Design a protein around this ligand. Structure first.
Ligand code: CLA
Ligand code: CLA
Ligand code: CLA
Ligand code: CLA
Ligand code: CLA
Ligand code: CLA
Ligand SMILES: CCCCCCCCCCCCCCCC(=O)OC[C@H](COP(=O)(O)OC[C@@H](O)CO)OC(=O)CCCCCCCCCCCCCCC
Ligand SMILES: CC(=O)O[C@H]1CC(C)(C)C(=C=C/C(C)=C/C=C/C(C)=C/C=C/C=C(C)/C=C/C=C(C)/C=C/[C@@]23O[C@]2(C)C[C@@H](O)CC3(C)C)[C@](C)(O)C1
Ligand code: KC2
Ligand SMILES: CC1=C(C#C/C(C)=C/C=C/C(C)=C/C=C/C=C(C)/C=C/C=C(C)/C=C/[C@@]23O[C@]2(C)C[C@@H](O)CC3(C)C)C(C)(C)C[C@H](O)C1
Ligand SMILES: CC1=C(C#C/C(C)=C/C=C/C(C)=C/C=C/C=C(C)/C=C/C=C(C)/C=C/[C@@]23O[C@]2(C)C[C@@H](O)CC3(C)C)C(C)(C)C[C@H](O)C1
Lengths: 69, 177, 194, 184, 99, 120
């Protein structure tokens, strides 16, 4: 159930990609993602394997600078 | 010629909202409810009340005269029938069905107000014994409205007098002093 | 344009082109909100499962497999049945569900990219008997949908009749039946108040 | 002259300028031999409210005209009922207490009067003007001449004021004496 | 605007100069800009008028659906349904006797 | 608006604001409604419109009097001149002793030198 919730949510976020959609929920798409999240185990393993789950750490902010530039 | 005066109250001008609607021959609205609320909503509510009250009046008359459906749970008087059937379980199911029908009525009202459909206030599409000519349709709508209004008043009187005198529907053999 | 089924409501515009929509009936706009392809696939699935379910519900009360302890109240047949065989039924259902849709099982995956050209309810099962003429094909599709809808309603009625009677389906009124008044007994707000 | 309410309502509402006449030229300020403009406290100086004042005056006069006759008649005759008999209620002044409350006899009168007033409030407020103050269209027997209409309005106002004072006198005398008509 | 169609709406400069009656036979109404977003314009009557002035608000099903689509209503409804489901499960199967 | 109340309102309002008073003032309401109603203009008003106009226009007793305005002006003038109409706090308030003291000391900008009977 928890993986279902997480998958649904991540899928809505990926599909929307907009603060406006985050604020005013696109209820049709949200319900669609909630329903679709039932195959989350297979879908998540497939994305992990194929590289669509995690992005390289060089594509995201690492944190504060610890040295001189 | 000045304003157009209400035939019902000759010393008041007819509300412009209730012109061209069935029942404008009387033009009765001294308190000016049509000047404050949409006439479409007002007429929808009036027709709903009239129909419900006609059914309620006929049902109260029938139960008071007798004619109870077969079964032990229904051997109660009309006044206590509400509570008896609420306990029995008939009334909750009836209310579920009312909620279904009223969901559809609410959709009809919303669509009418938004203009999606050219639906008249109380029209649901039923055409039975409906005259073809426009004058006949107007007369039939007026007949519906007047019978419904009479039924509203009649049900109010019936329920109140029944609760007061504890008599049957005619109330003719009742004592008042 | 008023809907045929509900002449006091606007006609739904997104459900056109599907068999069984003669009386265009979508008062709540579900076809507008969601994809009619998915909705029709789900409707077909419910119809088929429910008509098979009604037939099985009737049959189980009388006839059972050798062994397979019976349960006159077919609602209890799930508990009374061999758990391994019930799990086998679930396994076969899952295999069919996965294979028919290739893995695009979800509301988003199915009818997306490849597989969108597939008809809503078509699983390419028993299509050899589909009449060639489009008139007869559409008539058969409408017959399937009507039988499926009637089966859905009939299965709901069967289950709830079993619940109210607390007994087998076939005797509609058990001996000494007096009414369903006492079945819904758990305390409610208004019931407790009055 | 008096025009139909439909035409008269064309120019209706709270006027802001003032016809320079006593009480805007309304009828009812006329002595027996000359002109009697009675307004010691200068209430009529509120010309915008003058129509409201005349409407209220006529309402009070009509109501008190009914009330005085309703205090006189009951002692001579009563409704053919057991609860209206002289034994149940000796004098009219007792009627209020006798019929108040759960009996509903006076509650019905109050209810119907309230309904009538709710229906007439629209004229009282919106369609009130110098010419339609107290005019509900019940103009049967109204003379078809300017002088006749003015005299009839004056007679109504004078009788209404006389009954307005006479009802107070009669009710007070009846409460003080507990006696039949003559002292009321 | 359909509500005021057929009404003679005179600007404050024309007050008293225009005396033509309305379609409903009412006198002309003075229109003023208030510079208020909630009530941009206000109308005064030149005399007694017999006109429709709706006090009910104008609510659209699209507006209601947008308001419910607001994340707050969506998630509050979701949480209320979830809490009701858990409560009803506790009612129907108390004490977890099956476990 | 009555003549006396109009005179009182004009007296209360600053003179410079008569030309074009601010939006939220009785004088502004009077200007807006007198430009639309009166002689040579709309001589009638709906009962409700007139009722609202009388509700939102000021009555005579709402505005300050000549003596009250004089007292307030004297108070403000004293405080700005650096003199304090002496008062002592009492129970949930303060009494006026009827005395005018020199609040500011020899050094006007020095907060150490403000005069008080206790120290000065
Ligand atoms: C406003 C409409 C209305 C409402 C709210 C009710 C409500 C009720 N009726 Mg019904 N009733 C109605 C109209 C209505 N009636 C009419 C028009 C009739 C005339 C045919 C009847 C005739 C009727 C009978 C004969 C009995 C009831 C009874 C009852 C109670 C149980 C429901 C039932 O068995 O209905 C039965 C409904 C029908 C037989 C036909 C209804 C036909 C139209 C569509 C309504 C319940 C208090 C029972 C009760 O408890 O009586 C004390 C009962 O014995 N009603
Ligand atoms: C979706 C429909 C559906 C579902 C969910 C079930 C479910 C079940 N059926 Mg089946 N059954 C179905 C359709 C269905 N049936 C149909 C269409 C028929 C008619 C041929 C049957 C005829 C049938 C028989 C004769 C028996 C079952 C039995 C059972 C139970 C165990 C064996 C099994 O599943 O196989 C299980 C609860 C067995 C049982 O009685 O279990 C208690 C059993 O003996 N079913
Ligand atoms: C109930 C038992 C059951 C059974 C017998 C099957 C059978 C199948 N599933 Mg699975 N599946 C199940 C439950 C089941 N599924 C459930 C509960 C879900 C939802 C979480 C899925 C979701 C799912 C997906 C999304 C896919 C399968 C696929 C498959 C294939 C197995 C591939 C495999 O294991 O390769 C060896 C390891 C086969 C048709 C795949 C398929 O059919 O690809 C063509 C596929 O893509 N299944
Ligand atoms: C998914 C969650 C869920 C589920 C499965 C059920 C299931 C049930 N509820 Mg409900 N219930 C829910 C949420 C849920 N409830 C919530 C969130 C509330 C708080 C208002 C309630 C409050 C509630 C009460 C007080 C009662 C039920 C009852 C019932 C039963 C009949 C259906 C009904 O009246 O629904 C009602 C469902 C609602 C969401 C209530 C509507 C709330 C407002 C008016 C918005 C519409 C059934 C067991 C009744 C019953 O049969 O009792 C014996 C009953 O008495 N429920
Ligand atoms: C302000 C007007 C007024 C009011 C408030 C009342 C009030 C009352 N009158 Mg009435 N009454 C009135 C005018 C009024 N009367 C007039 C003008 C007449 C002359 C026709 C009567 C003649 C009258 C009689 C003969 C009796 C009453 C009685 C009563 C009492 C019972 C109601 C009734 O039978 O009314 C009946 C009223 C009428 C038949 C005429 C109403 C005429 C107009 C519309 C008023 C009640 C206290 C009863 C009483 O004395 O109880 C102790 C009673 O027997 N009244
Ligand atoms: C909010 C709470 C509060 C309360 C309950 C009071 C209560 C009081 N104040 Mg007020 N006052 C308040 C706040 C409050 N004050 C504030 C915040 C200030 C500062 C501006 C003042 C400034 C003030 C002054 C200047 C005076 C009062 C005075 C009074 C008294 C007036 C009644 C009187 O004398 O009756 C008895 C008469 C018969 C009373 C004890 C008067 C007084 O005598 O105070 C000692 C007075 O002259 N108050
Ligand atoms: C539209 C939205 C979609 C709706 C879909 C269908 C909804 C069905 C609802 C079923 C609830 C069923 C339901 O609530 O009843 C269930 C319950 C029955 O309790 P009892 O006392 O009968 O308990 C005995 C048990 O046997 C009950 O199972 O009664 C109530 O609590 C009702 C209280 C309000 C009753 C109102 C009376 C009506 C008065 C007339 C005017 C009403 C105006 C309308 C209000 C706006
Ligand atoms: C090569 C290949 O692929 O094979 C082919 C083979 C073949 C045969 C050619 C094919 C097919 C078609 C099939 C198998 C079609 C089956 C259709 C069924 C089983 C329909 C059941 C309807 C039940 C209804 C309406 C029940 C209705 C029940 C009702 C109304 C019950 C109502 C009551 O229960 C209620 C609700 C309460 C009770 O107390 C009272 C009663 C009245 C009994 C395929 C698909 O091409 C595949
Ligand atoms: C200012 C002094 C003054 C006083 C102190 C005073 C006192 C009383 C008292 C109590 C002591 C009574 C009971 C009484 C009664 C009536 N007064 Mg009178 N009155 C005063 C002045 C005038 C004027 C100027 C007129 C007038 C009139 C009438 C009429 C006629 C009504 C009619 O039939 O129209 C009646 C009944 C008018 C008229 O025409 O009288 C022939 C008229 O013009 N009064 N008046
Ligand atoms: C109060 C009182 C009394 C009284 C009274 C009075 C005046 C009572 C009045 C009662 C009254 C006036 C009751 C009307 C009922 C009308 C009904 C039920 C109409 C149904 C109509 C139906 C079902 C129509 C349906 C259809 O149109 C539909 C929807 C569409 C088309 O397919 C056509 C058809 C036809 C199929 C006494 C007795 C005098 C004294 C006592 O002391 C106190
Ligand atoms: C019985 C009763 C009840 C009651 C009651 C009711 C309805 C009571 C009603 C009382 C009422 C209606 C009382 C009027 C008084 C009028 C006065 C005082 C007029 C003075 C007038 C004076 C002093 C002077 C007038 C003039 O100087 C003027 C202005 C100008 C001059 O040119 C002419 C004259 C000199 C004449 C209850 C509560 C309903 C139930 C309870 O159970 C008991």
């Amino acid at each position: 159930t928890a993986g279902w919730i997480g998958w649904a949510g991540r899928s809505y976020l990926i599909r929307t990609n907009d603060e406006t959609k985050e604020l005013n929920i696109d209820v049709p798409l949200a319900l669609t993602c909630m329903a679709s999240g039932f195959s989350w185990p297979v879908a998540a393993w497939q994305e992990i394997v194929n590289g669509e789950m995690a992005v390289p750490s060089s594509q995201i902010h690492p944190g504060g600078p610890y040295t001189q530039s | 010629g000045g304003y157009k005066m209400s035939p019902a109250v000759p010393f008041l001008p007819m509300s412009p909202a209730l012109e061209g609607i069935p029942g404008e021959e009387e033009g009765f609205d001294p308190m000016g409810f049509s000047l404050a609320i949409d006439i479409r909503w007002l007429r929808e509510a009036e027709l709903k009340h009239g129909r419900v009250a006609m059914l309620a009046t006929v049902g109260w008359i029938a139960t008071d005269l007798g004619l109870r459906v077969p079964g032990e749970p229904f051997q109660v008087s009309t006044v206590e029938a509400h509570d008896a059937m609420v306990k029995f379980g008939s009334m909750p199911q009836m209310l579920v069905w009312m909620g279904y029908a009223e969901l559809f009525g609410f959709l009809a009202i919303v669509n009418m107000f938004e203009g999606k459909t050219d639906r008249k206030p109380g029209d649901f599409g039923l055409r039975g014994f409906y005259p073809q000519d426009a004058k006949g349709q107007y007369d039939m709508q007026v007949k519906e409205l007047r019978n419904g209004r009479l039924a509203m008043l009649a049900y109010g009187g019936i329920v109140t007098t029944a609760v007061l005198t504890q008599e049957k529907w005619p109330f003719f053999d009742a004592v008042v002093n | 344009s008023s809907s045929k089924s509900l002449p006091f409501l606007p006609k739904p515009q997104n459900l056109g082109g599907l068999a069984g929509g003669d009386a265009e009936f979508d008062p709540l706009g579900f076809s507008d909100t969601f994809d009619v392809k998915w909705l029709r696939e789900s409707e077909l699935k419910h119809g088929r499962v429910c008509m098979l379910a009604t037939v099985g519900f009737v049959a189980e009360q009388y006839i059972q497999f050798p062994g397979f302890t019976p349960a006159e109240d077919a609602l209890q047949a799930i508990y009374t049945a061999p758990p391994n065989i019930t799990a086998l039924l679930l396994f076969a259902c899952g295999y069919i569900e996965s294979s028919a849709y290739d893995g695009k099982l979800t509301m988003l995956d199915m009818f997306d990219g490849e597989g969108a050209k597939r008809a809503p309810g078509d699983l390419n099962f028993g299509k050899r008997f589909l009449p060639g003429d489009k008139a007869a094909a559409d008539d058969l599709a409408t017959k399937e949908l009507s039988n499926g809808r009637l089966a859905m309603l009939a299965f709901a009625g069967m289950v709830h009749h079993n619940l109210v009677v607390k007994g087998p389906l076939f005797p509609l009124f058990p001996e000494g039946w007096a009414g369903p008044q006492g079945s819904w007994d758990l305390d409610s707000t208004a019931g407790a108040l009055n | 002259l008096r025009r139909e309410l439909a035409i008269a309502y064309e120019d209706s509402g709270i006027d802001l300028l003032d016809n320079g006449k006593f009480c805007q030229g309304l009828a009812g300020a006329d002595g027996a031999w000359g002109r009697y403009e009675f307004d010691p406290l200068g209430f009529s100086k509120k010309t915008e409210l003058v129509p409201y004042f005349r409407e209220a005056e006529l309402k009070h006069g009509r109501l008190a005209m009914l009330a005085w006759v309703g205090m006189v008649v009951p002692d001579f005759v009563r409704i053919p009922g057991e609860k209206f008999s002289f034994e149940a209620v000796p004098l009219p002044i007792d009627g209020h207490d006798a019929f108040s409350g759960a009996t509903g006899v006076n509650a019905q009168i109050l209810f119907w009067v309230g309904i009538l007033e709710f229906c007439c409030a629209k004229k009282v407020f919106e369609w009130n003007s110098l010419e339609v103050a107290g005019d509900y269209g019940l103009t049967k027997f109204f003379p078809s001449d300017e002088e006749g209409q003015k005299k009839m309005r004056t007679a109504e106002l004078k009788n209404g004021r006389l009954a307005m004072l006479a009802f107070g006198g009669a009710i007070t005398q009846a409460v003080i004496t507990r006696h039949p008509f003559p002292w009321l | 605007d359909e509500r005021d169609e057929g009404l003679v709406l005179i600007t404050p400069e024309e007050s008293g100069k225009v005396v033509k009656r309305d379609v409903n036979n009412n006198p002309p109404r003075i229109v003023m800009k208030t510079n208020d977003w909630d009530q941009p314009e206000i109308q005064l009557s030149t005399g007694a008028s017999n006109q429709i002035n709706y006090i009910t608000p104008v609510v659209a099903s699209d507006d209601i659906k947008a308001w419910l689509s607001l994340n707050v209503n969506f998630f509050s409804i979701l949480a209320l349904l979830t809490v009701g489901g858990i409560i009803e499960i506790q009612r129907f199967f108390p004490d977890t006797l099956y476990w | 608006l009555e003549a006396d109340v109009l005179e009182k309102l004009l007296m209360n309002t600053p003179r410079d604001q008569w030309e074009d008073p601010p939006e939220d003032t009785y004088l502004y309401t009077l200007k807006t409604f007198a430009e639309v109603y009166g002689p040579g203009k709309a001589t009638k008003m709906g009962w409700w419109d007139y009722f609202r106009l009388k509700l939102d226009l000021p009555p005579g007793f709402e505005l300050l009097d000549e003596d009250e305005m004089k007292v307030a002006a004297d108070y403000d003038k004293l405080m700005m001149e650096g003199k304090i109409p002496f008062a002592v706090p009492g129970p949930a308030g303060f009494w006026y002793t009827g005395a005018v003291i020199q609040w500011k000391g020899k050094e006007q900008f020095a907060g150490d030198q403000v005069q008080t009977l206790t120290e000065n």
